Design a binder for this molecule. Structure first.
Ligand SMILES: *[C@@H]1O[C@H](CO)[C@@H](O[C@@H]2O[C@H](CO)[C@@H](O)[C@H](O)[C@H]2NC(C)=O)[C@H](O)[C@H]1NC(C)=O
Ligand SMILES: *[C@@H]1O[C@H](CO)[C@@H](O[C@@H]2O[C@H](CO)[C@@H](O)[C@H](O)[C@H]2NC(C)=O)[C@H](O)[C@H]1NC(C)=O
Ligand SMILES: *[C@@H]1O[C@H](CO)[C@@H](O[C@@H]2O[C@H](CO)[C@@H](O)[C@H](O)[C@H]2NC(C)=O)[C@H](O)[C@H]1NC(C)=O
Ligand SMILES: *[C@@H]1O[C@H](CO)[C@@H](O[C@@H]2O[C@H](CO)[C@@H](O)[C@H](O)[C@H]2NC(C)=O)[C@H](O)[C@H]1NC(C)=O
Ligand SMILES: *[C@@H]1O[C@H](CO)[C@@H](O[C@@H]2O[C@H](CO)[C@@H](O)[C@H](O)[C@H]2NC(C)=O)[C@H](O)[C@H]1NC(C)=O
Ligand SMILES: *[C@@H]1O[C@H](CO)[C@@H](O[C@@H]2O[C@H](CO)[C@@H](O)[C@H](O)[C@H]2NC(C)=O)[C@H](O)[C@H]1NC(C)=O
Ligand SMILES: *[C@@H]1O[C@H](CO)[C@@H](O)[C@H](O)[C@H]1NC(C)=O
Ligand SMILES: [Zn+2]
Lengths: 557, 198
């Protein structure tokens, strides 16, 4: 009964009560999301505040078991997850000021408006209307106007708020023994005391910089090709040896290059595979899509759906008036309640999103036997990677022609393969330099290596050097161009998009070999192979029980 | 002939909790096992001592019917030689068990939208239970070394909790009604047992 058995007895009671309260809160939130009313809002808010209060109470109660004499690594993991103060280490004045600036930055980003210089009564927001210009337009002057005015009229309002946000977050982080907010964020990949699978919080920077060094030869050739193809759409504006102007890239920031496909398609006379009309001509409905997805998942040896999944899920848009947030998600309400919320049409993209979301559902069904605190991916990048490899495998012509959506012969050619691979590289590869550079800038800013009178100087230096894009108008220290992105002004970490992109492919390569694939990797289809299902299930069922370096080894080696 | 009143311990409109399980002793009568075996799917029907087929030619002194309600994934614990929060603090079966067990799903009966907190179970206790022991005490379990004087708080918890049964649960978190029969033959020459065809 020394100090350890008391911790176990405490954790049992916590598990029970937290499971109940979490089910209640999640059910309320689901009810609100699938049926938007007024009463539902406060009905969900009540359960939410109750859950948050219970969590804070248990967190403060759990400090009375020191972490030093607990020997079981599972108990230590749970107690360490429950003991973290987070905020509330600050004063009351300071905490309230922090929440105020967070909400102010979010509201500035959400409702900022810019309008025409020649008709000032025509103001456009960002979402419906600015990043439509940026995605569709081909007018150099209009793109430049949108790009400049968004950063000049809304970006400049976030600078004095971000400067304060940095200080307050750094204080909150150092009061938990972390040296800055950047280290607090990197603390998600840390492992301690396993003797073979350890991982430090400062090693992540080294791994990121050492893996990025091998992508530069491919990103450089993609950059050169895209520059050569853009020199025909905007002649006399691009230089054949310089960077790319930052407003010609496909959206407001250049995060993905996926909208330059129409300009840079290799063989424009070969339309790529699109089994959409073959679906409507075969009378496919929202239920047939998910039945096919479930059959695909059972093919590799994974279980069926839970039979409550078919009754409680909202697979179609509710017709008359039942307004719901039509955003596809997988819900894990708890106690064995798995659901899917999406308003599916009959297309090809929804045929892939079905697989992507049922991947999440299968991950959730896998580790449902773990203690409540240890139900999540091994780290922040595992869940979406497990989701993405499913849509990767289910969109190959070998799978589509075996379902019945392609002609039984359908001779393929290498030109269509190049079309497909370039459409993929404009999204997967075009976003790795951006992600790396942005998170590097934020790390160096939180650390103090960039004084606050050199933020924009270093931002655009690193943009010209690492990413390879140049600004069309000089920006002094009255701007804040980072904060004009959603993840920067809404306080989200950004490295989970870099690591996931890697893990994803690793998983695929480890699952292609178990299924004994022969040709190129981009033609893999893991269906009908149970060894791949087993290699995947050996990692899905761990949750956070084991360090992420171990779970990764259970698949890749 | 007075038949066995199996129609009550099976049709009880309100079952008992697992920490306080119901026990009904059946006296000298004729035992009709053919009313339940032909009855229903019976998600669980496991017989250990006798074979489930020949209940109609063997006889025993008296039979006990123990009735309660547990979660779905705890039915596996109702078996001789099992460990768990149910087989340790709520209901125990001796390894030389001679009766048998049956269980079925009752989601449409014992579950209500909003929570059915009328079903309890004990998850804290000082020591394991003995075979067929029943404990209803509500003393505040003391975890640490400091006495807690009959109040809840740090290192002293309430020993009983509730199944928040709801209809939107998964098989395994849903209510299951369990009835276990237990046979006995001490010395009685002529006792209650099954019927013969005449
Ligand atoms: C969506 O939510 C609204 C408001 O909560 C529901 O509207 C009422 O719900 C009560 C709940 O028992 C019913 O008694 C009323 O008849 C409902 N009135 C109307 C006009 O709908 C609504 O039922 C919910 N929708 C669904 C599909 O459950
Ligand atoms: C303390 O650690 C031990 C092993 O270090 C855990 O023992 C495991 O217990 C689970 C179920 O409780 C079994 O499924 C495993 O097979 C056990 N492992 C071994 C190696 O015996 C124990 O569970 C830990 N304590 C807690 C509260 O989880
Ligand atoms: C969490 O925050 C508290 C203060 O809010 C830190 O201070 C300790 O709190 C415990 C619980 O009341 C006291 O017993 C200690 O005396 C406090 N001071 C210490 C430990 O120096 C606490 O350290 C924080 N915990 C973590 C893990 O950061
Ligand atoms: C796609 O494959 C075809 C057939 O292999 C390629 O056509 C040949 O390409 C080689 C390499 O330049 C030439 O030497 C041959 O003369 C071509 N064949 C004919 C009939 O002209 C084609 O180049 C490949 N295209 C891509 C993009 O990989
Ligand atoms: C997975 O294997 C099954 C079983 O072989 C395949 O289903 C058969 O496919 C052949 C080839 O077209 C048909 O002639 C049979 O009629 C199918 N039988 C059934 C019961 O479906 C299935 O096509 C395979 N899937 C993949 C993706 O390879
Ligand atoms: C358990 O109880 C129910 C309800 O009391 C019984 O259902 C009765 O079934 C008979 C024959 O089918 C009907 O005539 C009655 O009307 C039903 N009762 C009600 C209230 O509708 C059921 O038969 C009972 N089970 C056993 C084995 O006796
Ligand atoms: C899945 O459900 C189907 C019925 O739709 C059934 O035929 C099949 O055997 C089930 N498989 C598993 C593994 O549950
Ligand atoms: Zn996803």
């Amino acid at each position: 009964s020394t100090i350890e058995e008391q911790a176990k007895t405490f954790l049992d009671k916590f598990n029970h009560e937290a499971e109940d309260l979490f089910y209640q809160s999640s059910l309320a939130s689901w009810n609100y999301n699938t049926n938007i009313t007024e009463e539902n809002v406060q009905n969900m808010n009540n359960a939410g505040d109750k859950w948050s209060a219970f969590l804070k109470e248990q967190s403060t109660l759990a400090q009375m078991y020191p972490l030093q004499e607990i020997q079981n690594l599972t108990v230590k993991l749970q107690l360490q997850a429950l003991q973290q103060n987070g905020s509330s280490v600050l004063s009351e004045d300071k905490s309230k000021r922090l929440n105020t600036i967070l909400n102010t930055m979010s509201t500035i980003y959400s409702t900022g408006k810019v309008c025409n210089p020649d008709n000032p009564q025509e103001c456009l927001l960002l979402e419906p209307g600015l990043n439509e210009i940026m995605a569709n337009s081909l007018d150099y002057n209009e793109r430049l106007w949108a790009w400049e005015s968004w950063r000049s009229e809304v970006g400049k309002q976030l600078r004095p708020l971000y400067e304060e946000y940095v200080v307050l977050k750094n204080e909150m982080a150092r009061a938990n023994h972390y040296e800055d907010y950047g280290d607090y964020w990197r603390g998600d990949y840390e492992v301690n005391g396993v003797d073979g699978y350890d991982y430090s919080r400062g090693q992540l920077i080294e791994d990121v910089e050492h893996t990025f060094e091998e992508i530069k030869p491919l990103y450089e050739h993609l950059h050169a090709y895209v520059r050569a193809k853009l020199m025909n759409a905007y002649p006399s504006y691009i230089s054949p040896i310089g960077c790319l102007p930052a407003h010609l890239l496909g959206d407001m920031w250049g995060r993905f290059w996926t909208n330059l496909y129409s300009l840079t398609v290799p063989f424009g006379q070969k339309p790529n595979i699109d089994v959409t009309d073959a679906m409507v001509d075969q009378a496919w409905d929202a239920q047939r899509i998910f039945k096919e997805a479930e059959k695909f998942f059972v093919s590799v040896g994974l279980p069926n759906m839970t039979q409550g999944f078919w009754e409680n899920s909202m697979l179609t848009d509710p017709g008359n008036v039942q307004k719901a947030v039509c955003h596809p998600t997988a819900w894990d309400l708890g106690k064995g309640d798995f659901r899917i919320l999406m308003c599916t049409k009959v297309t090809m993209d929804d045929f892939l999103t079905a697989h992507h979301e049922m991947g999440h559902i299968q991950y959730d069904m896998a580790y449902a036997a773990q203690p409540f605190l240890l139900r999540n991916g091994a780290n922040e990048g595992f869940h979406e990677a497990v989701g993405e490899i499913m849509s990767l495998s289910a969109a190959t012509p070998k799978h589509l022609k075996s379902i019945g959506l392609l002609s039984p012969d359908f001779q393929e050619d290498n030109e269509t393969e190049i079309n497909f691979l370039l459409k993929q590289a404009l999204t997967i590869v075009g976003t790795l330099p951006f992600t790396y550079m942005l998170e590097k800038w934020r790390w160096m800013v939180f650390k103090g290596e960039i004084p606050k009178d050199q933020w924009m100087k270093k931002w655009w230096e690193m943009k010209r050097e690492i990413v390879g894009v140049v600004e069309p108008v000089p920006h002094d220290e009255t701007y804040c161009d980072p904060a004009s992105l959603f993840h920067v002004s809404n306080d989200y970490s950004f490295i989970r998009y870099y690591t996931r992109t890697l893990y994803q492919f690793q998983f695929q390569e480890a699952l292609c070999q178990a299924a004994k694939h022969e040709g190129p990797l981009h033609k893999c289809d893991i269906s009908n192979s149970t060894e791949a299902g087993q290699k995947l299930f050996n990692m899905l069922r761990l949750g956070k029980s084991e360090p992420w370096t171990l779970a990764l080894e259970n698949v890749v080696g | 002939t007075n038949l066995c009143p199996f129609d009550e311990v099976f049709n009880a409109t309100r079952f008992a909790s697992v920490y306080a399980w119901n026990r009904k002793r059946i006296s000298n009568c004729v035992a009709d096992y053919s009313v339940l075996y032909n009855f229903a799917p019976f998600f669980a029907f496991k017989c250990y001592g006798v074979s489930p087929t020949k209940l109609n030619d063997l006889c025993f002194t008296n039979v006990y019917a123990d009735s309660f309600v547990i979660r779905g994934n705890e039915v596996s614990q109702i078996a001789p030689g099992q460990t768990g929060n149910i087989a340790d603090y709520n209901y125990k079966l001796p390894d030389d068990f001679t009766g048998c067990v049956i269980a079925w799903n009752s989601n449409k009966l014992d579950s209500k939208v909003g929570g059915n907190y009328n079903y309890l179970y004990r998850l804290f206790r000082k020591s394991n239970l003995k075979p067929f022991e029943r404990d209803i005490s509500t003393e505040i379990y003391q975890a640490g070394n400091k006495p807690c004087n009959g109040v809840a708080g740090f290192n002293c918890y309430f020993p009983l909790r509730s199944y928040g049964f709801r209809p939107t649960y998964g098989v395994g978190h849903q209510p299951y009604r369990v009835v276990v029969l237990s046979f006995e033959l001490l010395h009685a020459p002529a006792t209650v047992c099954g019927p013969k065809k005449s």
